[PDB]
Structure formats: structure tokens, C-alpha cells
């Protein structure tokens with residue numbers, strides 16, 4: 321049972337709930353990693 | 361490049377003994393536990409290797425289906441439990457590409473069955489800073505060593 325059941329505290333829960341309603345815009349670093357993945 | 365990213369292939373042999381990412385726990389996991397756990401369906405192992413018949417592993421990641429719940433509603437997700445990059449390839453942007461490859465797998469699976477997000481395990485502070493630079497949302501208290509990236513953000517990355 322290695323991180324297959326995330327039992328979130330109320331604050332950690334809201335962070336996720338909020339990440340789903342307001343999804344982060346992919347940053348410049350992540351976009352670079354995705355450009356590398358394209359060429360493979 | 362010579363390097364490729366693939367799911368471990370069940371009937372193949374990999375060069376693993378030489379691997380060193382600078383953390384004994386990850387090295388050990390690769391050279392003694394990764395193959396048995398993948399084959400027993402405990403986790404899904406993905407390998408960054410040289411694309412030669414000798415197949416020299418230079419990095420890996422693990423994936424497992426999971427679900428987040430709270431205390432006193434459930435969300436079905438995927439967890440990246442382990443990520444490692446061999447010393448030789450460090451400072452070359454390979455670790456992030458592995459997380460991006462991870463994100464493309466999780467996205468694909470959401471499109472097929474319905475998965476809402478990607479969770480990650482950050483055991484030390486150096487990793488915590490890594491996933492945060494990739495836009496992972498840091499969780500608090502009991503969930504300190506976990507960060508989350510929604511499927512919708514993953515979708516944006518390969519769609520935008």
C-alpha cells in the first residue's frame with residue numbers, strides 16, 4: 321500500500337478541489353519537457 | 361539522441377547493475393525490486409534506456425492507480441511513486457521529460473476510463489522543489505510528501 325490511498329486533510333483536499341476548478345497553466349519548463357517528448 | 365522511453369517489456373533483459381542516481385534506496389529498488397513488482401502487477405515500470413539490444417537503463421519511473429479521499433467524496437487518480445535519473449544524464453532535462461511522458465500516459469488513460477489527476481511522491485526537499493518547478497500543487501500537513509497536477513492541466517500541455 322504505497323501511495324495508492326491518498327487520505328487528504330481538509331486543507332490538502334481544498335488545494336486539489338481548487339486545482340480541478342482552476343487548472344494550472346503549464347509553465348515554460350514543463351512545455352520544454354513536452355517538446356523533447358515530441359522529438360522521441 | 362540514442363535514448364528512448366518505454367514500458368518495461370515483459371520478455372526482455374535490461375542492464376541495471378551499473379545504474380547510480382545518487383540515492384541508494386532508488387538504485388536498490390531498480391536492481392532488486394522493480395522487475396518483480398512490474399511483472400506481479402504491483403506497479404507499472406517505465407524505463408529511460410539507450411535503445412541498443414543491450415538495453416542500458418539510465419532512468420525510471422513507476423505508476424500505480426490510486427484514489428484520494430478526505431476525512432469526517434473520492435477522486436480516482438494515478439500516482440508516480442518513484443522517479444530516478446542516472447548521474448551521467450543529470451543536468452540534461454531528462455527527469456522532467458520522464459514526468460512529461462508520465463503525464464501523457466495518465467492523460468491517455470483518463471481519455472479511455474476517466475482519471476482526474478496525477479499525484480506524486482516527494483520524499484526529500486530537492487524533489488519537492490523539482491515537481492513544484494513543473495507546476496505540481498504542494499499538499500500540506502499529513503499529505504506533505506504529495507503534490508498534485510490535474511488531468512485538465514496535462515490536457516493543456518499537449519493541446520495548447
Ligand SMILES: CC(=O)SCCNC(=O)CCNC(=O)[C@H](O)C(C)(C)COP(=O)(O)OP(=O)(O)OC[C@H]1O[C@@H](n2cnc3c(N)ncnc32)[C@H](O)[C@@H]1OP(=O)(O)O
Pocket residue numbers: 349352381382383443444445449450451452453454455456457484486487488490493
Ligand atoms: C538529494 C541529494 O542530495 S542527492 C539524491 C538525489 N535525489 C533523487 O534522485 C530523488 C529523485 N530525483 C528527483 O526528484 C529529480 O529527478 C532530480 C531532483 C534528481 C532532478 O533530476 P534532473 O533530471 O536533473 O532534473 P530535470 O530532468 O528537470 O533536468 C535537470 C535540470 O536541467 C535543466 N534542463 C532541462 N532541460 C535541459 C536540457 N535539454 N539541457 C540541459 N539542461 C536542461 C532543468 O531546468 C532541470 O532543472 P532541475 O535540476 O531544477 O530539475
Ligand SMILES: [Mg+2]
Pocket residue numbers: 445449450451452453454455
Ligand atoms: Mg537530466
